[model samples]
Target: EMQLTPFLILLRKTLEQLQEKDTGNIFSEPVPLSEVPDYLDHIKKPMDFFTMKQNLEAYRYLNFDDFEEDFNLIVSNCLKYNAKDTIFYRAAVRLREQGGAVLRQARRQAEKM
Candidate 1:
């Protein structure tokens, strides 16, 4: 027999990790991936950072390195406009940069058992 984790539960756990800081708004207004399937349907972005930041949880489901480059570019542009300290920025950065590491660590620990 086989079982699967619900996508909603995975999203919730990922969000919990992403929101551990409680920015209060990092994910306060979640833009469900169901609403923006196009942006994350692949490793590339046909959309831009301004849009990605709004629908951040989508990043939690994608390959980190694929988005890291784009994320860097977006951050650079947003900082030029003084949007560095926003909850969205913080969460977006954390999810893109560190979320993968967290998942890798968990997978390693599970493999140890």
Candidate 2:
């Protein structure tokens, strides 16, 4: 019998919570490049919840920090691509704070294991 590591379980739950947030809908999928032609120009490396989920299932993350990097990258890419006054930018900021809180909790819980 086998079970996921504690950190992996925590990471999965964190991702689920992030994805369910109201502000998270916009960041759930990859940017539509054809719709926003300049997205690639502004964001050198784009990340999203769907891609993160895929990576998680694929065992792409070796540690919580690796997963956290991608999580933060999604928000950073949004903030970089959208102007400060835009809804997308604000959404990114909100999502970042929400995700950050859960990530910190997860880190603390993982450290106890």
Candidate 3:
């Protein structure tokens, strides 16, 4: 059977990445101090980043809005003021991933309806 998880992961990544250009307030509150995730650095390459992204996307079924918002904040924070940071590029990759996941979710939702 085809795995739908990756597709959903893409959706989570994409929606979060694009909100940067859009005027929305998804991340209005601070992330919980008790749940602070480990800091990441020099992810090495796009794939290393994808590992983290896929884990986030895996939760799309439970709460999409929260997932998307968190992804956006993480990506933005990862980028330094310098232009050479890899965060933005990885964000793009994850957005492309979002495209795939979103398409899958759409088809699945449509079928259910």
Candidate 4:
């Protein structure tokens, strides 16, 4: 079994919690390029939960800030792509607000160690 460091444990925990959110469903996977052809045109840097998880497993994140950047990008991409009245935009707003709290809590827990 692979042992996770304190930082990894907290980061993973934060991601799992975010995934459980209702808004998380929309951000769980990549925006279907076929369905939304203009997504890439608007979002220069796309991010999603699945990609983040893969990166985590691959040990791509060297620090908490790197993980946080990806997390923020997920929401930012959504807001940038969808209009304010759209469900995707609202979902992203909620995820950003709630996920920020999750990240902050995890950071504090990791710091205690």
Candidate 5:
């Protein structure tokens, strides 16, 4: 089955939260979901809607039982997404930490084989 990736989950959650806002993603300025990808292409600078979408997409697993590939993909994206932004270096650290946790889970699930 096609399990959701971290990117997928996190992106959805974040978007949901943003949508809940009174202005509906009009934070600081108006933002629509369609303009998310290019909007958040960079992390070193301020966040755009795309950045918000990418974040939600990172951890969105539909089923936890069999999605190692999806999980790894999410971790990879998380790392890459966080590689930029010298000022947001801490986000990189968070990415690593999240990756470690996901790896541990993957390993544990694999041991069942």
Candidate 6:
């Protein structure tokens, strides 16, 4: 059925928010809907956009059902262990933005659908 990956959904939501604000240099052009999946699949690090993107993408790949809880667990551990600079923490903090909550919430919903 080609279910939407949480990764793809998050990217679309993030990009749409950026396009609305017209900032962040996140995309040079408005990324097309058809191309969104591929843009996400080919994501890489150092590209903060894709770096964070790939992190959440990897989280979805892990097949977790309770992302907000697990996501918070990881975040709390990062704080407890002072792992802010860690890869997971980098990904977690991006959830700081309002859109980040959308990304976080999308994870479980995507799993359900």
lDDT of 6: 0.43
- For each candidate in the order shown, give its overall lDDT on alpha carbons: 0.43, 0.84, 0.43, 0.84, 0.40, 0.43
lDDT (tens digit, per residue) of candidate 4 on 1-113: 22357667777888899888744388888999999988788688888999999999888875778998999999889888898999899998898888888888877776676
Task: Give the clashing residue pairs of candidate 6, or none.
Answer: none
- The digit string of per-residue lDDT tens for model 3 on 1-113 reads 33456646555555554443322322223333355343234422222224435555565344445444445444455343215455444544454465346545644653443
The estimated TM-scores of all candidates read 0.32, 0.89, 0.27, 0.90, 0.30, 0.29
User: Looking at model 2, which ten-residue stretch has the lowest summed lDDT?
Assistant: 1-10
- Higher-lDDT candidate of 5 and 6: 6
Q: Evaluate residue 2 in candidate 6 and report its C-alpha lDDT on the 0 to 100 scale.
A: 39
lDDT of 2 by residue, 1-113 (tens): 22357657877888898787735378888998989988887688889999999999898975779999999999899888889999998998998888888888877876676
Those runs of model 6 whose alpha carbons end farther than 4 Å from true positions after fitting are 1-11, 18-45, 50-95
Model 2 bad stretches (over 4 Å): 1-4, 22-24
Q: Backbone clashes per model, in order?
A: 0, 0, 4, 0, 17, 0
TM-score-based ranking, best first? 4, 2, 1, 5, 6, 3
> What is candidate 6's lDDT per residue for 1-113, written digit by digit as tens?
33546546654565445334324443233234374444434332112333334555665433433333433443343334335676544544544454445555665555466
Q: Write the per-residue lDDT of candidate 5 for residues 1-113, one digit (tens) a residue.
A: 33345434433543343334313222323233375465356423343334434433454334433233433333344345544654234443454465456545544543443
RMSD of each: 9.0, 2.6, 11.7, 3.0, 10.0, 11.4
| Highest-scoring model, TM-score | 4
